Every structure is written in structure tokens, then in C-alpha cells.
């Protein structure tokens, strides 16, 4: 008969988020955080309150 067991381990999931490292590119990670904004809205706008002088 088998005896009891305890295991130490770590989280896995279905994430395909990927980060780069000096030694290895495209390493797949459980969790990640984008810090680059690549999107804008294509318009000229009022700034804090104030409409710009658009000549």
C-alpha cells in the first residue's frame, strides 16, 4: 500500500502572454502587464477645458 504525500508546486494557466528577457525572447508567462499605449483617437480636442485655436 502507498503512504501519504505532500507536494510543492506553482501556478499554471491558459495564458499566452509573452515577455522578453536578455537571455531569451518570447518567454510565455502566466501573467503580464503592458505598459505601452499604442492607440489614439485621430482627433484634435479641447485640452483640460479649453478649445485650441485651430487656424
Amino acid at each position, epitope marked *: 500500500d502507498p503512504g501519504d504525500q505532500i507536494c510543492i508546486g506553482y501556478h499554471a494557466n491558459n495564458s499566452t502572454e509573452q515577455v522578453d528577457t536578455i537571455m531569451e525572447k518570447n518567454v510565455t508567462v502566466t501573467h503580464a502587464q503592458d505598459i505601452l499605449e499604442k492607440k489614439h483617437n485621430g482627433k484634435l*480636442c*479641447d485640452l483640460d*477645458g*479649453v*478649445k485650441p485655436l*485651430i487656424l
Partner: nanobody
């Protein structure tokens, strides 16, 4: 300079509909948003809605959402408002007005005033 010429006073049977017009002049139509103000005769001012010419985007007051319909003739450089199924309530004065910049803007140029009377 910046003149907003609007429709002449009208009379409408209760339950019917009106279409008052506002003709813009003195600036470039598509650079400022146009709005309409209702003033119950010598009382207090109410905001109806606003429209941006260049793409035809509308922004309404909760109260007027159903009864009103702002339209723009870019070709004609003219702004329109349309009031559906009127009552004695709607008998008041209506102003076509240019709001300066966006959601957080001031009304700098106020139109003449189309004054509507609702009676059988």
C-alpha cells in the same frame, strides 16, 4: 461677424409638428457645435440638445429625447430642429445657439429666436 439667422415665428395645432431652421454665417460651419435652447416665456432657460455638423452627431436632454430631432444641412450650412406632437407645454421661444468647444463649452453666439405658439 458670427450671425445665426433662424426661422420666423410659427403657430401649430396641438398634436402636430414643427420644423424651425437656423442658418449659420460668419464662421466655418463644421468647426463648432450648434445647440438649441427653450425658454418658457419670461421664466427660465432649458437645454434641449446639440449637434455637430461635420459628422451629424447629436447630444440630447433626457426631457426632450423623444419629442425632438436635430438635423443639419451641411450643403445648405443650416441647422434644423423638429418638435413632434406638441402641447401647450411647448409653447415658448426657441434659440439656435453656437457652443464653443465641446461638452465643456460656453454658448457665445445666440440666435434671433423662433417663437412657437401651440393653439387650435
Amino acid at each position: 461677424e458670427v450671425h445665426l439667422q433662424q426661422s420666423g415665428p410659427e403657430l401649430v395645432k396641438p398634436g402636430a409638428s414643427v420644423k424651425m431652421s437656423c442658418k449659420t454665417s460668419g464662421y466655418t460651419f463644421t468647426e463648432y457645435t450648434i445647440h438649441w435652447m427653450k425658454q418658457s416665456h419670461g421664466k427660465s432657460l432649458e437645454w434641449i440638445g446639440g449637434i455637430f455638423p461635420n459628422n451629424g452627431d447629436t447630444t440630447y436632454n433626457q426631457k426632450f429625447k423623444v419629442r425632438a430631432t436635430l438635423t443639419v444641412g451641411r450643403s445648405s450650412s443650416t441647422a434644423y430642429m423638429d418638435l413632434r406632437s406638441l402641447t401647450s407645454e411647448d409653447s415658448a421661444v426657441y434659440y439656435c445657439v453656437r457652443n464653443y468647444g465641446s461638452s465643456y463649452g460656453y454658448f457665445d453666439v445666440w440666435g434671433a429666436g423662433t417663437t412657437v405658439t401651440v393653439s387650435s
